[PDB]
Each structure stands twice: as structure tokens, then as C-alpha cells.
Design a binder for this molecule. Structure first.
Ligand SMILES: CC(C)(C)C(=O)Nc1nnc(S(N)(=O)=O)s1
Ligand SMILES: [Zn+2]
Length: 257
């Protein structure tokens, strides 16, 4: 099964998921000087006030904080998007060292981690249908750098002990994802894919320019998670990031000059 090891990592995924070599794969390097400001891009509308988190799950590749997406409670709109995209889950990708971990890069710079807030286009009714559409998902990507703690992340950090191993979940209600956002909603956007198998080319990527800062202690706790299940040899959940993929016939657009 696919993963992030030497024998099952990103360089192997194409054998089971040939789209791994597709025309709109993610992540990509964001070359800031080549991205073009698009004055027609609207500001993002992040409407998370009514978000209902439910559960946090270690799925063996990352941990997902899941939301009630059976109504328009937490939605992403605007920016490059047409229509309404419902928040379904967020998760992170992170490194074994602070100098790596993000999936997108900025002028080849890797951040310590990257947060993905995943939303699906409500016009497709369910996420399973949405992922079969070129505009099915919108993922808001937020870089993490190590410095000051992010207070709004601590509730996530502190539950990780209870989901150390693959397949463990814990109740995770009343978490406010607004506490994970940076000040600015300036962003880059481009059409891409899921960065994990099945690598479907269904994502409008919206990557915020402003990273959030998290503390070394916060990211160290991410790195204590396990890829393995309980009672199996311990493999630390670290470096669960896919590297940058060829941009091919795509232009990255910037919301800001
Ligand atoms: C909801 C559903 C489709 C199961 C999902 O979100 N799957 C993801 N698979 N990779 C993602 S990434 N790293 O591109 O945000 S999201
Ligand atoms: Zn992701």
C-alpha cells in the first residue's frame, strides 16, 4: 500500500495511480516572480463561524479533523471559486526536521508543515462525486513555520496522544478552525490534484501567502504520531509530504500585487 517510505513513497505511486504523472498534479513549487497578479480574483470568503468539528482520525498517513458537512456550516467561497465549497476536514503534512514538511514550496523554500483545509463543491452533492470533477474540491493550503506557538493549534496538539496510531479516532467537537488562519488571506491559486492517492485532478488550490507560526513543541508533537497501527513496530509519522510536481501547462495566479 502507498505511503511515504523508500519502498512505497511518492516515486512509486504512479504504478497504482498513473495519474501521478498527469497534467495537473499537486503540489507544485510556487515561483513568486512568475505567478501573475490577477485583478479579477475576488477576495476569499472564509465563513467558518458555524463550523462543527466532530472527530479527529489518524488515518495512517496524517490526521484529519473532520467536520459536519451535511449542511452549509463552514464554507469557502469567492477567490477563484464559483459557488460554495463545504469544509469537510483539515489535516497537515509535516517533516522530520523544521526545514521540510510542506508540499507546496515557495521559490523552492520548504516550510516545516502545511495545513490543508479541504472543501467540496456543494453542486456535486457529496465529496465522492466532487472528486470526479475538475472543480470538485477547493483546498486552502497554509504554510507552517516554526517560531511562536499558534494558540489555536494547541487543542489539536493535545489530542494527538489519543490518536497515536493508524485507525485511532477521538471525539473532537467545538474546534474553531478560524484559529488556524493567518492575518492575511492573500493567496496564490492554480488547478491541481489531491496530493495523496488517488491523486485525482479535482482541486482548485488556494495557497495563502502568509504562513502561520507554530512552536517547536507543537510540531514535535506532530512528529510523535505513528504511521503504524497499535501493536505494530513504531514508525514515526514524519515526512508525510509529496514533493513538488511539474507545473506543466498551468499558470499560478496571485490575488495580490
Ligand atoms: C474528502 C476526501 C476526498 C477523502 C479528501 O479530502 N481526500 C484528500 N486526499 N488528499 C487531500 S490533499 N493532501 O490534497 O488535501 S484531501
Ligand atoms: Zn493534504
Amino acid at each position: 500500500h502507498w505511503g511515504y517510505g523508500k519502498h512505497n513513497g511518492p516515486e512509486h505511486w504512479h504504478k497504482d495511480f498513473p495519474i501521478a504523472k498527469g497534467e495537473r498534479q499537486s503540489p507544485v513549487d510556487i515561483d513568486t516572480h512568475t505567478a501573475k497578479y490577477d485583478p479579477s480574483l475576488k477576495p476569499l470568503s472564509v465563513s467558518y463561524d458555524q463550523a462543527t468539528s466532530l472527530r479527529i482520525l489518524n488515518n495512517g498517513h496524517a490526521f484529519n479533523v473532520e467536520f459536519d458537512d451535511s449542511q452549509d456550516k463552514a464554507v469557502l467561497k469567492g477567490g477563484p471559486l464559483d459557488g460554495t465549497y463545504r469544509l469537510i476536514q483539515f489535516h497537515f503534512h509535516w517533516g522530520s526536521l523544521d526545514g521540510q514538511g510542506s508540499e507546496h514550496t515557495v521559490d523552492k523554500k520548504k516550510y516545516a508543515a502545511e495545513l490543508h483545509l479541504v472543501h467540496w463543491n456543494t453542486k456535486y452533492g457529496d465529496f465522492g462525486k466532487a472528486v470526479q470533477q475538475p472543480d470538485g474540491l477547493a483546498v486552502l493550503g497554509i504554510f507552517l513555520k516554526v517560531g511562536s506557538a499558534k494558540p489555536g493549534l494547541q487543542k489539536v496538539v493535545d489530542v494527538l496522544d489519543s490518536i497515536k496510531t493508524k485507525g485511532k479516532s477521538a471525539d473532537f467537537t467545538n474546534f474553531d478552525p478560524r484559529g488556524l488562519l493567518p492575518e492575511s488571506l492573500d493567496y496564490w491559486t492554480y488547478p491541481g490534484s489531491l496530493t495523496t492517492p488517488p491523486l485525482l485532478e479535482c482541486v482548485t488550490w488556494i495557497v495563502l501567502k502568509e504562513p502561520i507560526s507554530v512552536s517547536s513543541e507543537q510540531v514535535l508533537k506532530f512528529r510523535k504520531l505513528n504511521f503504524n497501527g497499535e501493536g505494530e513496530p513504531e514508525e514515526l509519522m514524519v515526512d508525510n509530504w509529496r514533493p513538488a510536481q511539474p507545473l506543466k501547462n498551468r499558470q499560478i495566479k496571485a490575488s495580490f500585487k
